[PDB]
């Protein structure tokens, strides 16, 4: 199971808007573009695109610049669709790309946008029709249906998207196709004469998809004392912890269960 995903953010300024774009293979970033830069270009963020040709990066750059130009117009037109003023600032978000299942055939294709953080228009799983959140979004919908937009995007997602995803995965297999198991341990903190805290740690793992659950005598438990959002370590790996409050002497009842792709089998720890 893999994915290539692009994320664009166009933020209006009171002249040229700021256009930022990022691209990920799975949970690794490999490309960046920022209009607020001195001479904006496509910039690699992973070694397996650093040795691509200069033609490759010229082309990617040209398409980033064209998308920035287009997003200025888009912010204006959205301002028109919702009949908004011009003093306030707004945001256009775009996400598109392809997800391969474990087969590893195309599982899904994505082309969806957002205005002011709200769903705008999204290409459906069929890659043949559109979900518009608003009748205003249906202006765009009818524009695209008249132009057979879904057709072209199906051609890209089923075609060159999966091809360059597979090819990136190839040239970076030493990186992208090696899962790091979580290094795990448990900490303990007496709170009071009645309570203590167990905290189950998972560190240095890749990809970010992981499952941490506390059980009591073999029964999943929910109170807890927290489950924390999976966070980036800063070196390409991720972190997460799950903690629970327990009676101050019954720690042995409580086990921690870790599921991660890089583990040959789910792990069970305890303090």
């Amino acid at each position: 199971s893999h994915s290539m995903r692009y994320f664009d953010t166009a933020v209006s300024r009171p002249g040229e808007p700021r256009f930022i774009s990022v691209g990920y293979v799975d949970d690794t970033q490999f490309v960046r573009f920022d209009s607020d830069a001195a001479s904006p270009r496509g910039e690699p963020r992973a070694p397996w695109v650093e040795q691509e040709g200069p033609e490759y990066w010229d082309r990617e750059t040209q398409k980033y610049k064209r998308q920035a130009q287009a997003d200025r117009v888009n912010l204006r037109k959205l301002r028109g669709y919702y009949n908004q003023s011009e003093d306030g600032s707004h945001t256009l978000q775009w996400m598109y790309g392809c997800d391969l299942g474990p087969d590893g055939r195309l599982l899904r294709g994505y082309d969806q946008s957002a205005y002011d953080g709200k769903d705008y228009i999204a290409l459906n799983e069929d890659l043949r029709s559109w979900t518009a959140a608003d009748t205003a979004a249906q202006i765009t919908q009818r524009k695209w249906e008249a132009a057979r937009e879904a057709e072209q995007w199906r051609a890209y997602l089923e075609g060159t998207c999966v091809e360059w995803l597979r090819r990136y995965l190839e040239n970076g297999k030493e990186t992208l196709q090696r899962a790091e198991h979580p290094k795990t341990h448990v900490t303990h903190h007496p709170v009071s004469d009645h309570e203590a805290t167990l905290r189950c740690w998972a560190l240095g793992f890749y990809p970010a998809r992981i499952t941490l659950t506390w059980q009591r005598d073999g029964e999943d438990q929910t109170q807890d004392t927290e489950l924390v959002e999976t966070r980036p370590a800063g070196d390409g790996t991720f972190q997460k912890w799950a903690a629970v409050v327990v009676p101050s002497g019954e720690e042995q009842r409580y086990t921690c269960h870790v599921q991660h792709e890089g583990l040959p089998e789910p792990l069970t720890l305890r303090w």
Binding site: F7, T9, V11, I20, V22, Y24, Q29, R32, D34, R45, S89, T91, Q93, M95, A114, D116, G117, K118, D119, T187, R199, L203, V228, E229, R231, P232, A233, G234, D235, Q239
Partner: protein
């Protein structure tokens, strides 16, 4: 929509006083995109701080990782200060993790 930021203050590796490490402040789930994020050492702002490129989540919420080099000690307190249009005042989260 306006979404208030979530903040996690943590270190890249398990802290060991004397050893070089990276301090991290991870802000997520916020909207709109403009935000202030600083790492504090004993209340003062750390100068050489970098951040990741702007991305967002399935729900269109932004996230960012701000980070710096530091060497943990025993009395040096570290924090993350975040400011954002949804906050009536900047928020400080003290560094703890074990």
């Amino acid at each position: 929509m306006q979404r208030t930021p979530k903040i996690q203050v943590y270190s890249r590796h398990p802290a060991e006083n004397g050893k070089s490490n990276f301090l991290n402040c991870y802000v997520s789930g916020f909207h709109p995109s403009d935000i202030e994020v600083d790492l504090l050492k004993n209340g003062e702002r750390i100068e050489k701080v970098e951040h990741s490129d702007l991305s967002f989540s399935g729900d269109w919420s932004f996230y960012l990782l701000y980070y710096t080099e530091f060497t943990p000690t025993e009395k040096d307190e570290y924090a993350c200060r975040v400011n954002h249009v949804t906050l009536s005042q900047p928020k400080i989260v003290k560094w703890d993790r074990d």
